[PDB]
């Protein structure tokens, strides 16, 4: 009858409850992603972000980079991934240096964002090195 | 309602009696399907009774056509596959008779007062007037109809395994 | 009240026996049309014009197939008048185009007289005032008989002129020798 209602029963907030924003598929997927899952240390949050993101990011670098058709094609795609991860970790470092000023495990604080970007850098270089193993042998 | 008496013991099950014989329990699981079940039992019963007479009578006498003879078809068991133009005319006129019962099948519950299996078909008037032996006349149709349901499976496989005449070997 | 011609049907309400050939024969209810510039006035003017055109067409065929074409048009020589038209068009096409534009001026004036005669009430349908001998001056019972005789001969000639077109365009012979062909074919 009506699959679009105002969000939070509030007709004047700038948001709608559609089956993209408020479906049970969306509510159950988003609450279990490591950005929003309840029982997670901020080191473990970023570690799951890094393991997801460092794994696929070796993909475009090995198959499309300048050393495509070489015998060092995989280690060139791995080194380009680590260089991209260090750029992204620098972006996380300068974000937390400006946004947060001086309860733990709450992600949007200064002490926890240093845990969050540390876990991202370990997980992203770890899963880029893991895909280095699975693509070679 | 009328078919649940006995004593008539169940063979290969010496403890069970046939009085209120319902081990799966279709009467309590779905009681609204019970007038559909009685209509289906009588239609299975009346078709199997003519199937028993129809399986042993063409063993001796044949209809005077010369595509139904013993030289044409000695066995009754392959007459279904040997006379296809004879089967469509049985299937066609039964299909007409069955299509005129769809508004009776569509009102088998509490729609109108037709009892299941009662097609108001008594031209010779053999239904008794007193009610207490009408039920045993109904019980005689069910017991003879249930027996012919068992028997036509034994008649056909008794002739499919051992190709022989009437009794069997 | 029932129709005279179709006594199982009710009488059509706009037909009341005032017109000449009125016996209530409108089963499709076409006299009740009042929308796309068409009403009972337009259909009666169309009936009367179809009557008079077809009446002249029948004797216009029977004049040439009996006594030949007119002098100046002796180039026809065909009893089939659907084919004899194309021999007059082949040789003297200007007189046919003279008549067809003279009809065009007459018919466009008659189309104005029909729609102005319908909006006003001073013109009967199919009436042009062409009574030069003056049959309409006296004996209104004998004048209504002439109004009915025009309609009765005109409704008959409508079938005859449509037939002589169609059995001239399909047999290529002519009307009177289509008639002799049918007489010898179906004699018993």
């Amino acid at each position: 009858a009506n699959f679009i209602k105002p969000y939070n029963d509030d007709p004047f907030v700038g948001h709608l409850a559609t089956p993209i924003t408020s479906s049970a598929v969306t509510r159950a997927l988003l609450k279990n992603l490591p950005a929003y899952r309840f029982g997670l240390t901020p080191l473990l949050r970023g570690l799951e972000i890094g393991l997801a993101h460092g794994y696929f990011l070796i993909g475009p670098f090995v198959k499309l980079g300048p050393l495509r058709n070489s015998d060092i094609a995989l280690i060139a795609g791995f080194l380009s991934t680590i260089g991209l991860i260090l750029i992204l970790t620098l972006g996380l470092t300068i974000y937390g240096a400006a946004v947060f000023n001086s309860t733990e495990t709450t992600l949007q604080t200064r002490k926890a964002w240093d845990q969050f970007k540390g876990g991202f850098f370990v997980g992203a270089c770890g899963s880029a090195g893991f895909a280095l193993i699975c693509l070679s042998s | 309602m009328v078919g649940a008496e006995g004593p008539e013991p169940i063979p290969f099950a010496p403890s069970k009696t046939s009085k209120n014989f319902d081990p799966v329990g279709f009467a309590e699981r779905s009681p609204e399907w019970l007038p559909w079940y009685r209509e289906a039992e009588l239609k299975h019963g009346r078709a199997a009774m003519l199937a028993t007479v129809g399986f042993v009578v063409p063993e001796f006498i044949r209809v005077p056509g010369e595509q139904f003879s013993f030289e044409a078809i000695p066995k009754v068991i392959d007459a279904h596959d040997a006379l296809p133009e004879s089967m469509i005319q049985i299937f066609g006129w039964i299909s007409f008779l069955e299509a005129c019962t769809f508004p009776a099948m569509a009102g088998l519950g509490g729609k109108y007062d037709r009892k299941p299996g009662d097609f108001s078909f008594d031209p010779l008037g053999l239904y008794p007037t007193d009610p207490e032996k009408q039920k045993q006349m109904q019980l005689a149709e069910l017991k003879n109809g249930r027996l012919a349901m068992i028997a036509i499976g034994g008649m056909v496989t008794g002739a499919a395994v051992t190709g022989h005449g009437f009794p069997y070997l | 009240e029932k129709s005279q011609s179709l006594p199982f049907m009710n009488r059509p309400p706009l037909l009341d026996g005032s017109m000449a050939g009125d016996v209530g024969f409108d089963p499709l209810g076409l006299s009740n049309i009042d929308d796309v510039g068409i009403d009972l006035y337009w259909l009666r003017e169309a009936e009367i014009k179809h009557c008079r055109v077809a009446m002249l067409a029948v004797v216009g065929i029977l004049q040439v197939e009996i006594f030949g074409p007119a002098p100046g048009c002796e180039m026809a020589t065909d009893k089939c008048q659907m084919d004899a038209f194309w021999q007059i068009w082949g040789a003297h096409p200007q007189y046919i185009a003279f008549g067809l534009i003279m009809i065009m001026m007459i018919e466009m004036i008659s189309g104005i007289a029909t729609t102005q005669g319908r909006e006003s009430g001073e013109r009967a349908p199919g009436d042009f005032g062409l009574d030069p001998l003056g049959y309409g001056k006296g004996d209104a019972a004998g004048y209504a008989r002439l109004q009915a005789q025009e309609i009765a001969n005109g409704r008959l000639a409508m079938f005859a002129a449509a037939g002589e077109i169609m059995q001239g365009c399909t047999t290529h012979q002519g009307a009177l020798e289509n008639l002799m062909t049918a007489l010898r074919d179906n004699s018993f």
């Binding site: 009858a1 009506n2 699959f3 209602k5 409850a17 089956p19 408020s22 479906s23 049970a24 598929v25 509510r27 159950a28 997927l29 279990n32 | 329990g25 279709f26 309590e28 699981r29 779905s30 609204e32 399907w33 | -």
Partner: protein, 163 residues
């Protein structure tokens, strides 16, 4: 009992259709598992029919445009690395539907969570829910009858109308 608050699927010509009495006496918990089974069988079989009918005559491109004219032999030449992918990929959704199931206002086939917007009290939403389960029930038996005529009778196409 359970059928009084679960009126989806109760459509003409039948009423509540249960000759064998499998719903009689059973709890609402196991009856909700039967609706979860009926909808999941009906939704896989509706997608199985559209998977069968496209690959039988039409648009079997690609897997390099080869491998497929008949749907049952086409389940052989593809690698099993592509099979357990499909097995793990559906099991990711079967895992996510468990999280949708472990929620208070969950209805036994509502993976989308349409009970947030409409309930079974408006007739147009019940009528469209019945259209899914009727076409699911029809595509269940019509997938089995067309699997079995390609397993045994050899033909994978339209044995009723033409080809």
């Amino acid at each position: 009992a359970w059928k009084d608050e679960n009126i989806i699927g109760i459509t003409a010509p039948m009423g509540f259709f249960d000759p064998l009495g499998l719903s009689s006496g059973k709890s609402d918990e196991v009856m909700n598992l039967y609706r979860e089974a009926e909808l999941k069988h009906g939704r896989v079989a509706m997608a199985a029919c559209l998977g069968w009918y496209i690959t039988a005559a039409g648009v079997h491109p690609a897997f390099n445009s080869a491998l497929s004219s008949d749907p049952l032999e086409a389940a052989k030449q593809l690698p099993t690395v592509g099979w357990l992918q499909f097995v793990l990929g559906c099991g990711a959704i079967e895992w996510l539907a468990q999280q949708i199931k472990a929620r208070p206002g969950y209805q036994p086939g509502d993976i989308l969570g349409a009970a947030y917007w409409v309930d079974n009290s408006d007739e147009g939403w019940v009528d469209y829910q019945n259209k899914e389960i009727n076409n699911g029930r029809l595509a269940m038996v019509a997938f089995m009858g067309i699997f079995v005529q390609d397993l045994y009778f050899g033909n994978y196409g339209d044995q009723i109308f033409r080809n």
